[PDB]
Amino acid sequence: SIPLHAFRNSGADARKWKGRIALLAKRGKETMRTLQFPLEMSEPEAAAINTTPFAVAYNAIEGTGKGTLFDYWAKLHLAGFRFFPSATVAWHDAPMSGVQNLAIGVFATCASRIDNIYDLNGGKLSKLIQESATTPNVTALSWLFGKGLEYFRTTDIDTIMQDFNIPASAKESIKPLVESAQAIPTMTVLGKKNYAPFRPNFGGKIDSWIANYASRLMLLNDILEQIEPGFELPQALLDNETLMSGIDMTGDELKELIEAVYAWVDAAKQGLATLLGRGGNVDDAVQTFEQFSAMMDTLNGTLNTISARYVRAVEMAGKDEARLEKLIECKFDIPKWCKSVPKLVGISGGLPKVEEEIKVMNAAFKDVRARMFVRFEEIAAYVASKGAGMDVYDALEKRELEQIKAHIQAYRAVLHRIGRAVQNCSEKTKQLFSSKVIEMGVFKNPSHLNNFIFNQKGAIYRSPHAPYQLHADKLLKNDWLELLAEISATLMASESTEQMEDALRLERTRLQLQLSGLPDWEYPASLAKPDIEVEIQTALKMQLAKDTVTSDVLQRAFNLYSSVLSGLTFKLLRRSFSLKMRFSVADTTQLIYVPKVCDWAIPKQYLQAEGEIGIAARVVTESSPAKMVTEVEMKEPKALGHFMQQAPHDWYFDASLGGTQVAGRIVEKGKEVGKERKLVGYRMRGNSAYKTVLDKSLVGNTELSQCSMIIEIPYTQTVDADFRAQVQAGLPKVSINLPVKETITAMLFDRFVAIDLGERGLGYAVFDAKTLELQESGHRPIKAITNLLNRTHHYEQRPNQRQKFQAKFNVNLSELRENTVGDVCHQINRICAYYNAFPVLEYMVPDRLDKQLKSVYESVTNRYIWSSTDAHKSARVQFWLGGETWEHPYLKSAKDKKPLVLSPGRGAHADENAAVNIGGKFIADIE
RNA sequence: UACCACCCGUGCAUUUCUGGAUCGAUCCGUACCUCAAUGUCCGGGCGCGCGACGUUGGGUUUGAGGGGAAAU
């Protein structure tokens, strides 16, 4: 028998294992997976693709502006039209005019019709709203997007009014609806006359928005009902400076925030009433709602931070009880009404116009940088006018004195901040910094400095674990701000984009240290309020409203400058991105089966078989594969599928873009395989596994759902010394995305494996479920985890051509996290298959583990363990091929005396020992 | 069993058919994205210029994962 190291629960074999485990599931759902088939085009053919008509079509479909479908739909809704599944529209409701947010207006108009809405839960509200707006399975839009659009675009306003019996009062609401309809362009892509085929995706985005909005509104009804007046944080809590460190506001500021919250609770009851359609200005209601939500978010965040600090303090208290008594004196509660209503994403689409956007962002980066420099200059001038000079070292010495209640310590802190920015920098920048610090000789061991900047490990300054030893005289001698300025200048001279980014970062760091030197004074509002058009958090806005501001709030406004500049830097540093257009129709997928032009020697073993392939082999006399399939079609019609799967063939897709002229027969769901016909198409590229999936469809094992054509236009960006960016368009790439339902052709319950997620790998202990006794214990190490933790910099730097221009942040690290989760899950599944056992995971990922490692483990845990959160549950179901619930035949949970619910993972060398312990805890649970 | 040896990073490359039918054999299927490995580059750290000291350590799979689109 293969040891686990040689065992191969991988690829299609692991998909088959997952599928059999899912067949054992007591509760499951039908799941699809989308496979991407790169179409094969030659360079001339790719050049001949014109993505302009496609971009027009995508803007009309996915756009939220004028001349898009969303605009026309919203206009119909606000004109006083009600949507009916089977002309699919009628004029009933009174027209709603003057709503800046059309989606919000629609949701409110539909909700006005609903009665006794407050008892209705978020889910029910969403359902009713979407039924009213999109008419189940988007049936009304079939008329409106095709024939209706033609009617509104080509029908006198008076005639429209006469047809739908509309009174003269609503004539205005109608005129914009007619004008919006006319503004829509003409669909030319995919051989489609009108927008009706695309109607599914529109329906779907609108429905997701409806659900989210309804859920938010009901969470707030709940919050407003729960508001209990007079909750206040104890004065003692506020007084504890240690507990306060890192709430980013003052105690007085927090009390002001709670009073603001009660006034806005009143305002929000009123605003939610207005949004459910009771009446009044939807736009004002929206602003009120958003402000209150932001307030309630900031308050909750602050409270959670304070609670975490409290928990840490309690953990440290330990044996000492005086500290515990002080903690009970400061003890605070988080009110149930306080609860984060997070910011909600609006409907957004179309494709970004790269060149216009790049001009805008060059301009913006230049402007923001100039403004930041000017602001810094102004702050410096105000402090100088008063007559006390900013000095980072003096300020740091004062801070150290306050913390005790030194010049060396100040210098050490400055050097440490510079060092952290250089840890964040590229290898060449790290090298420059290291060389310069060795030339200065401040570090006792240049080795320590090298390690700190390159290996990102160690600390030069500790804040009351030993800080790095330094030559004090040399340290007092070398200024650090000038060193930073020189490094920045040299990196800008390097004129390499990584080096330019590092220069920008170091300049920001220097400005930040100079500002940290500010004395403890009152500063006017003028210096404090950012002129960069940046969005500001509630706490900072409340601090800013006050005429006199502290050093820390001025620092925070400078940090806002820094953040805008950093986003603009990410936008100008990128060398590669793509503009992607996805088109999906309602029609069934037609593939083209093209038989290869060759001579096929069918096997003689095929000849003697009793299967469909055997029958087909018997009838064939022809020597060319097209002739052979025609022969099987004529003689053994049932045997066609298996013969076709085995014969020489290629898969093609028309894509309505021209392509190779081929002699092929269409393969379509439900319909029988067609007669050979002259068809055009683009060959679909894929490996043997993907081609096997399509072959299975011929037999009847796989079903293909509606196709999605993704066109990507690749772009390259270059930045000159002045930072103007130039963008160049690559040849377009077309791909077909196919959702596939695969019938699973006809163990978990017999044993159970306890999985421990350790820092360097995983540990497993396998216990027989019936006797609850250990069979074998072991450790499996994960190169992929260790590798991720190490190559963080490569991932960040990796150019992604695929990454969209719209993206405002780097997500290469997130994609790598996805691959890591994949790999750990693979190891767990492999162990399970080897022992025929069900996974047991620790319910809670340990807090001690590093951020990224912790996130990976949480994802792994979700993929197996049962969790309440919908996202987690959906991920787990998708991973387990539709398996939502399992029931154990002989295991009963001791606590409720109910048969074990497995999903299929139950919830409960160092790694090995910890896994045996988890297994033991699960054993104790079930008894 | 055999195999291979300080620990990593950074940049640049190269490679990976990994799915089926039928009775090991014959024939279909052409190979996408990502990671990884490997090679190389330059740069750290550690032990005593170098790099495991018969005995150790490490890995072993048909390298691994792929559910999109939207978003964040």
Residue numbers in the entry: 5 to 90, 239 to 557, 567 to 625, 631 to 912, 919 to 1080, 1199 to 1217
Copied sentences from the primary study:
Cas12c2 adopts a bilobed architecture consisting of recognition (REC) and nuclease (NUC) lobes.
In contrast, the Cas12c2–sgRNA binary complex adopts a closed conformation, in which the REC2 domain interacts with stem 3 of the tracrRNA. Notably, the PI domain is disordered in the binary complex structure, suggesting that the PI domain of Cas12c2 is flexible and stabilized by the interaction with the PAM duplex, whereas that of Cas12a is pre-ordered prior to DNA binding (Yamano et al., 2017). A structural comparison also revealed a local conformational change in the α1–α2 linker in the RuvC domain. In the binary complex, the α1–α2 linker adopts a loop conformation and interacts with the REC2 and WED domains, thereby stabilizing the closed conformation. In the Cas12c2–sgRNA complex structure, the first six nucleotides within the 17-nucleotide spacer sequence are ordered, and the α1–α2 linker in the RuvC domain is located near the ordered sixth spacer nucleotide, suggesting that the linker region facilitates the bending of the pre-crRNA toward the RuvC active site for the processing reaction. In the Cas12c2 structure, the sixth nucleotide in the 17-nucleotide spacer sequence is blocked by the α1–α2 linker in the RuvC domain, and the rest of the spacer is disordered, suggesting that the pre-crRNA is kinked at this position and extends toward the RuvC active site for the pre-crRNA processing. In contrast, the corresponding region (residues 1014–1022) of Cas12c2 adopts similar loop conformations between the binary and ternary complexes, suggesting that the Lid motif is not involved in the RuvC domain activation in Cas12c2, as in Cas12a (Swarts et al., 2017).
